[PDB]
Amino acid sequence: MKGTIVGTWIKTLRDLYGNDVVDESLKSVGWEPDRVITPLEDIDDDEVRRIFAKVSEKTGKNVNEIWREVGRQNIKTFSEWFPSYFAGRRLVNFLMMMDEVHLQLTKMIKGATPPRLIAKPVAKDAIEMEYVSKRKMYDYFLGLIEGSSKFFKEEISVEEVERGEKDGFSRLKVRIKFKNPVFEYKKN
Numbered sequence: 277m278k279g280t281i282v283g284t285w286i287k288t289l290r291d292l293y294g295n296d297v298v299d300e301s302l303k304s305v306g307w308e309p310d311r312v313i314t315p316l317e318d319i320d321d322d323e324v325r326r327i328f329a330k331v332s333e334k335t336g337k338n339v340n341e342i343w344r345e346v347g348r349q350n351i352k353t354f355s356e357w358f359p360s361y362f363a364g365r366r367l368v369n370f371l372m373m374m375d376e377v378h379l380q381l382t383k384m385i386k387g388a389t390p391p392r393l394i395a396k397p398v399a400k401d402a403i404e405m406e407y408v409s410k411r412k413m414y415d416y417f418l419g420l421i422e423g424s425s426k427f428f429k430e431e432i433s434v435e436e437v438e439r440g441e442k443d444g445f446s447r448l449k450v451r452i453k454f455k456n457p458v459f460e461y462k463k464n
């Protein structure tokens with residue numbers, strides 16, 4: 277995982293569960309509770325999974341529940357660290373932009389494996405978005421969508437069409453319906 281993001285996660289964990297749970301979880305994996313993660317640092321994914329498992333243990337919450345909660349809250353952390361991506365944006369616009377954003381923010385890393393998040397209109401008031409990644413972070417993905425809905429104050433309906441692994445990649449396809457029309461048919 278890219279260091280910058282793991283950093284936002286540590287902060288989000290502190291905002292949700294407190295400094296004691298977080299400092300202890302970090303120590304459990306050999307980290308200094310106040311460790312400084314550089315932007316381009318490549319934090320091992322399992323190491324992050326071990327931190328979340330420890331948070332799970334200490335909080336009594338299911339680890340998937342924690343990822344879901346971190347995803348909802350991390351949007352707020354994101355708007356504070358990367359305000360430029362939210363500045364005068366609408367939810368549909370924000371989401372359609374994500375696949376490109378993840379590519380741009382990892383292009384400086386050789387062999388980068390960002391999640392693919394291709395989205396496409398499928399109705400005047402709905403889009404289909406497919407999470408594709410080897411990391412299997414379904415709940416984080418679903419939580420970020422829910423958190424995004426809350427940030428932009430735009431109500432949505434999220435239908436999980438399919439989830440599973442195809443050719444080594446975990447995939448989750450959702451259909452996101454908005455309260456109002458957001459698309460119009462136009463000449464291709």
Ligand code: HEM
Nearest residue numbers: 277278281354358361381389390391409411413416417420
């Ligand atoms: C403007 C806010 C956002 C920024 C700056 C951002 C940035 C990033 C970056 C740099 C990574 C690390 C990728 C890697 O190390 O390979 C990441 C991971 C991830 N992002 Fe975002 N992201 C944002 C919002 C979102 C949203 C809204 C979604 C979902 C629709 C999303 C889905 C994910 C997921 C699921 C991962 C976890 C890694 C994986 O599953 O492979 N992100 N994000």
